[PDB]
UniProtKB/Swiss-Prot annotation:
The gene is rep. It is a multi-pass membrane protein. Residues 1-167 form the Macro domain. It comes from Severe acute respiratory syndrome coronavirus 2 (2019-nCoV). Inhibited in vitro by GRL-0617. It is found in: Host endoplasmic reticulum membrane. Responsible for the cleavages located at the N-terminus of the replicase polyprotein. Participates together with nsp4 in the assembly of virally-induced cytoplasmic double-membrane vesicles necessary for viral replication. Antagonizes innate immune induction of type I interferon by blocking the phosphorylation, dimerization and subsequent nuclear translocation of host IRF3. Also prevents host NF-kappa-B signaling. In addition, PL-PRO possesses a deubiquitinating/deISGylating activity and processes both 'Lys-48'- and 'Lys-63'-linked polyubiquitin chains from cellular substrates. The lineage of its organism: Viruses, Riboviria, Orthornavirae, Pisuviricota, Pisoniviricetes. Changing S164L: In strain: Gamma/P.1. This is Papain-like protease nsp3. May form homohexamers. Interacts with N protein. It catalyses: Thiol-dependent hydrolysis of ester, thioester, amide, peptide and isopeptide bonds formed by the C-terminal Gly of ubiquitin (a 76-residue protein attached to proteins as an intracellular targeting signal).
Length: 167
């Protein structure tokens, strides 16, 4: 049993809700919240900007020290940093950004990072401003992630479209 409420069950291990991931994280305080990061951990917009704003920029401060020490992530890669006030940990995962011309084929690699954590609160990788087809992203998620993932979809109309079209 866990603290996630009102999620629709898609598969054995994947659940989905129309929710703001920031508000979800603040309510649940999951062990792991996933950030839809870029390789520089520059948390400007989208989920990253929203999570970082909710940490009062502490996520960005920590991230800048991480990059200064380690250099950028890979597209498809991840790192574990603090969850600050939102979660125990934040798993920063870099899905490909189609609007930057990155290879959509790296989306599966990005979702494989979730398998290192038993339970996660996450957004749909590579959807929204990342420019990928969200139906595709959900399919890759369910076909790749084996651990328990609670997907928080911000856009209402998108949530309805994802559920109605799910195979
Ligand atoms: O939750 C959504 O509505 C879809 C989505 C997923 C990722 C990002 Cl970064 C964004 Cl902006 C939106």
């Amino acid at each position: 049993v866990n603290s996630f409420s009102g999620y629709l069950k898609l598969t054995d291990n994947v659940y989905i809700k129309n929710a703001d991931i920031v508000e979800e994280a603040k309510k649940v305080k999951p062990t792991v919240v996933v950030n839809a990061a870029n390789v520089y951990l520059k948390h400007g917009g989208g989920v990253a900007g929203a999570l970082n704003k909710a940490t009062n920029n502490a996520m960005q401060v920590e991230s800048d020290d991480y990059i200064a020490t380690n250099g950028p992530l890979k597209v498809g890669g991840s790192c574990v940093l603090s969850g600050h006030n939102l979660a125990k940990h934040c798993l920063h995962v870099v899905g490909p950004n189609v609007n930057k011309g990155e290879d959509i084929q790296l989306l599966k690699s990005a979702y494989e990072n979730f398998n290192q954590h038993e339970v996660l609160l996450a957004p749909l990788l590579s959807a929204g401003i990342f420019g990928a087809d969200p139906i595709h992203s959900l399919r890759v998620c369910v076909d790749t992630v084996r651990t328990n993932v609670y997907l928080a979809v911000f856009d209402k109309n998108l949530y309805d479209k994802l559920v109605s079209s799910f195979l």
